[PDB]
Design a protein around this ligand. Structure first.
Ligand SMILES: *[C@@H]1O[C@H](CO)[C@@H](O)[C@H](O)[C@H]1NC(C)=O
Ligand SMILES: *[C@@H]1O[C@H](CO)[C@@H](O)[C@H](O)[C@H]1NC(C)=O
Lengths: 49, 52
């Protein structure tokens, strides 16, 4: 006439602060460019969207 | 002590006065239905980033 009781549950690991993966949703992108121009015997550089 | 006309195979014994604390391993039975918490200790050696 003896009995035994057992129980368990699930938690989140401590290491999640270093080893993890992330899911993203993406939208329209922007663009940028950089150029070199030879102007009156000298090299100049430009940068713009 | 001594017990009169009471044979072996009919008795039980145990030690019950304790002064130190012990970890609650899943391989040892609980002393009471609701446990009595006394303290806690920490786990060393954390993680970090490195290169190999
Ligand atoms: C460096 O560690 C931090 C936390 O300690 C974490 O946020 C980061 O993602 C880690 N970087 C790499 C490259 O593992
Ligand atoms: C800079 O100008 C000279 C001409 O003066 C040219 O030969 C050179 O290629 C230019 N620099 C680069 C990185 O193209």
């Amino acid at each position: 006439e003896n009995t035994q009781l057992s129980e368990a549950h699930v938690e989140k690991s401590e290491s999640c602060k270093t080893e993890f993966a992330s899911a993203y949703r993406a939208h329209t992108a922007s663009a940028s460019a950089k150029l070199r121009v030879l102007y009156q015997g000298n090299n100049i550089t430009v940068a713009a969207y | 002590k001594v017990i009169n006309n009471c044979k072996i195979d009919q008795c039980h014994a145990a030690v019950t006065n304790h002064k130190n604390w012990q970890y609650n391993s899943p391989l040892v039975p609980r002393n009471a239905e609701l446990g009595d918490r006394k303290g806690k200790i920490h786990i060393p050696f954390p993680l970090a980033n490195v290169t190999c």
